[PDB]
Amino acid sequence: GSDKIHHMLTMKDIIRDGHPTLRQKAAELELPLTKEEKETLIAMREFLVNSQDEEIAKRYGLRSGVGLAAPQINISKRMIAVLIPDDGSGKSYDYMLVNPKIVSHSVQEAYLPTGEGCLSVDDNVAGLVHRHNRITIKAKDIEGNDIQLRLKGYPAIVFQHEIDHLNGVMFYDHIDKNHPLQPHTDAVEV
Ligand SMILES: [Fe+3]
């Protein structure tokens, strides 16, 4: 549930840290998806759309997000939605993915300088979350077609955050408790 920093689901449908489902390893899905699974993915994306719309988000008390993983709505299945709106350059990320898996991990690390938040986490944890600056993901889309993404920088970070949810990993598991805000030598600020 990467935060935005640049049935209609509502915030109570998003389980909170401490819920067991967030710590489980989600199930690989067979394609084609069931109708319920498709509706789930579509509703996860619609929640991000709603959360990004200033009026709808204010009207329904939504926290703005750019990613959501199915475990966060208590569905232990490997599905994520990422919706990073146009950053001003025309680059936009609108992907509903099934069984996403990182197949190439960039050695150079990158991090958001303010750390990371998560829609499932109300009590924020300070610290840099070092991630791969570049990644390649293989996944299936909602119709079971093949998608391979090459991502870098912020979008890479967002997808890594969401994929981590499928493995029961939260952003803070990456935080070095000894030197939380110290960037790794090689690391670059996103
Ligand atoms: Fe999250």
Side-chain angles (χ1 to χ4, degrees):
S2 293
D3 26 36
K4 190 173 201 195
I5 55 162
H6 305 290
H7 171 58
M8 175 191 168
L9 297 165
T10 62
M11 299 309 300
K12 286 190 183 273
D13 293 311
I14 293 173
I15 59 174
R16 303 308 182 213
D17 203 7
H19 193 295
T21 296
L22 296 171
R23 278 305 188 185
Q24 289 184 194
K25 186 165 178 186
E28 186 89 354
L29 292 194
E30 265 177 40
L31 281 300
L33 297 182
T34 65
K35 186 63 170 70
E36 174 180 66
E37 284 161 357
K38 293 192 174 181
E39 294 166 355
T40 298
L41 254 184
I42 290 165
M44 289 162 51
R45 176 185 179 282
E46 211 65 58
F47 166 85
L48 299 176
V49 169
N50 288 336
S51 83
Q52 287 176 27
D53 184 79
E54 191 160 343
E55 284 309 305
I56 290 292
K58 172 192 172 187
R59 181 175 317 139
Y60 298 113
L62 314 180
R63 178 168 167 195
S64 192
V66 293
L68 189 68
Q72 298 182 268
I73 55 173
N74 207 195
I75 295 173
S76 195
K77 298 184 180 182
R78 297 185 89 82
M79 297 188 283
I80 64 177
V82 171
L83 188 71
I84 301 175
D86 190 328
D87 70 354
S89 70
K91 290 177 112 191
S92 187
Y93 297 85
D94 178 354
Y95 291 92
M96 289 185 292
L97 304 182
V98 182
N99 302 333
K101 69 184 330 292
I102 300 179
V103 297
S104 180
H105 306 73
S106 139
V107 169
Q108 185 182 53
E109 296 185 309
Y111 59 93
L112 303 185
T114 57
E116 289 183 22
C118 184
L119 306 169
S120 284
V121 174
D122 294 304
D123 291 331
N124 289 101
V125 182
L128 302 183
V129 179
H130 291 271
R131 299 203 184 266
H132 293 103
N133 186 46
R134 291 180 163 281
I135 62 180
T136 299
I137 290 170
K138 285 186 178 178
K140 306 303 186 195
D141 70 13
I142 198 168
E143 289 303 315
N145 293 315
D146 307 329
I147 311 301
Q148 180 170 234
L149 306 200
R150 288 169 288 278
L151 301 158
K152 65 181 180 181
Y154 181 66
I157 285 182
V158 171
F159 277 87
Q160 282 171 83
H161 176 124
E162 307 315 325
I163 291 173
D164 272 354
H165 281 303
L166 305 184
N167 299 132
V169 173
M170 305 288 293
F171 68 90
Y172 54 74
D173 297 330
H174 292 102
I175 293 171
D176 183 327
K177 294 174 178 187
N178 295 318
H179 297 129
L181 261 290
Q182 196 178 79
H184 288 169
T185 291
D186 82 289
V188 303
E189 189 187 286
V190 175

